[PDB]
Amino acid sequence: GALESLRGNADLAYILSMEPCGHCLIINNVNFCRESGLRTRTGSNIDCEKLRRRFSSLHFMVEVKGDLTAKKMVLALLELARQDHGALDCCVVVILSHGCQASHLQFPGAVYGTDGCPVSVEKIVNIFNGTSCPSLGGKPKLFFIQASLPTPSDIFVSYSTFPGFVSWRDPKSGSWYVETLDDIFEQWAHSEDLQSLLLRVANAVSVKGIYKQMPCIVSMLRKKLFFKTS
Amino acid sequence: GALESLRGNADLAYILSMEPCGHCLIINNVNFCRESGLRTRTGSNIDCEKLRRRFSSLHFMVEVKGDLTAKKMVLALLELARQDHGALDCCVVVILSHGCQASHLQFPGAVYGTDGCPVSVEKIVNIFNGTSCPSLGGKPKLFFIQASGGLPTPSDIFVSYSTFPGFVSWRDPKSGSWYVETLDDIFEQWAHSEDLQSLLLRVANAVSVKGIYKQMPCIVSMLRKKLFFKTS
């Protein structure tokens, strides 16, 4: 009875009642220009599709964008924020690309464009601020990253691993993070909230191989997020 | 019981068997040099006292060090990391003082020393890394910062950076921090049955509802499990 009385408590949980839930934008970068020096990302496509599928399961509108340049990425993001989220309860943004640690004020890390030009996670998040995007005002804004005064609110960012470090793959079973995220979400998204799920993910992904991969979270959420399912 | 299971699941929750739970250092900068320009964080003595009884009640060997310089803070910290938390289950660091925002590579944030010189959160978190302190390896390492004004793989680190101005009594800048007061109350009511992350969400919501043209505590986590504090 408690679980149903919490999930329904609007002061402790973000009520995800609309159908569909919101937009989910997956940006998939695999092929990098020669000058950058970034190795082709084998398997990123199997990951992409797992996620596309998963968030669809979770009732989102998923659009994928493959191989985009720094300038095109920021253009998709501005486009997304430019939308009318009025009738939506949430918004998701996934970025499957190469990355690194970047100097920041609020949100760490940067992600590479197919052109090798970086984009700060921080710049990505803010594109979704209340001024530029009042439709998502007050609503949870999630950010999933598989890499290497408009006060920011309800911003959630998960990192395949603390920026600067290594994310371990396996072109066939998929990268640990995306695979584990898909699995755990499959298992529990119906009875468990976003932060609990990411705990299982982090813990799970933490027991593989020599080098330990360590999924991150940088949150400014006010309530627990329970994904809609079926 | 669902919660009962949750609490006792070693895979889903950092089990706290020992007693005490660990060390807790609260640095409390109240009086800053005049050149700093930074005002006297009065009322902070009330905040600090509330927090030391809170973490005390949470089973920690709390130690309070007030008015430290950027260097003495780094020293006070360096010390805590030289200890052998080996038999302990978790470590806590609370920092009350003025803070300044600055671009950084690893972690965001910085707190002001009594001298007026900044100490980046990056450096604070790093001081407790696996190497410099294996004693706390794999164990939960908590950092609560309340600062108005704003290959050692990182693991089991948790940083709560609040910058919520606002007193317990708005008419009196010396009544204490509304954030602290609010967090403390939240702990008094749910610690006995809600994990760290859940407690702080309650707090986050209370803050957002309290003020609007104000930010909200930013959390950064590398925890692998839930943390149910010891409460007797």
Return all residues near B66 (Cβ < 8 A) that are at least 6 apart.
B27, B28, B29, B30, B48
Q: In what order do the strands lie in the sheet with B60-66?
A: A60-66, A22-28, A90-96, A141-146, A155-159, A216-219, B218-221, B157-162, B141-146, B91-96, B22-28, B60-66
Residue type (1 letter), A57:
S
Give me B162's structure tokens: 């609040």
Total number of residues shown for chain A: 230
Q: In terms of Cα–Cα distance, which of B46, B138, B154, B38 is closest to B90?
A: B138
Method of determination?
X-ray
A88-98 burial: b if 16+ Cβ within 10 Å, else e: bbbbbbbbbbb
Question: Are residues B216 and A151, on separate chains, in Cβ contact within 8 Å?
Answer: yes
Burial class (CB in 10 A: 0-12, 13-18, 19+), A35: exposed
**Residue A164 CB coordination number (10 Å):** 17
Enclosing domain of residue A115: 1-230
Question: Are residues A105 and B108, on separate chains, in Cβ contact within 8 Å?
Answer: yes
Residue A77, SS3? helix
Q: Are B54 and B121 in contact (CB under 8 A)?
A: no
Residue type (1 letter), B184:
D
Chain B interface includes A212 (CB < 8 A): yes
Structural domains counted in chain B: 1
CATH of the domain at B17: 3.40.50.1460
Question: Are residues A107 and B106, on separate chains, in Cβ contact within 8 Å?
Answer: no
Q: Which of A2, A216, A218 sits opposite B2 (nearest CB)?
A: A2
Question: Are residues A220 and B223, on separate chains, in Cβ contact within 8 Å?
Answer: no
Question: Are residues B215 and A151, on separate chains, in Cβ contact within 8 Å?
Answer: yes
Q: How far is A13 from chain B (nearest CA, A)?
A: 10
Q: In terms of Cα–Cα distance, which of B38, B227, B36, B225 is closest to B147?
A: B38
Return all residues near B64 (Cβ < 8 A) that are at least 6 apart.
B26, B28, B48, B52
A-interface mutation test, from B155, B201, B207, most A Cβ less than 10 A away: B201
Residue A42, SS3? coil
To one decimal place, what's the resolution in Å? 2.8
The phi and psi torsions of A92 (rounded to 5 degrees) equal: -120, 150
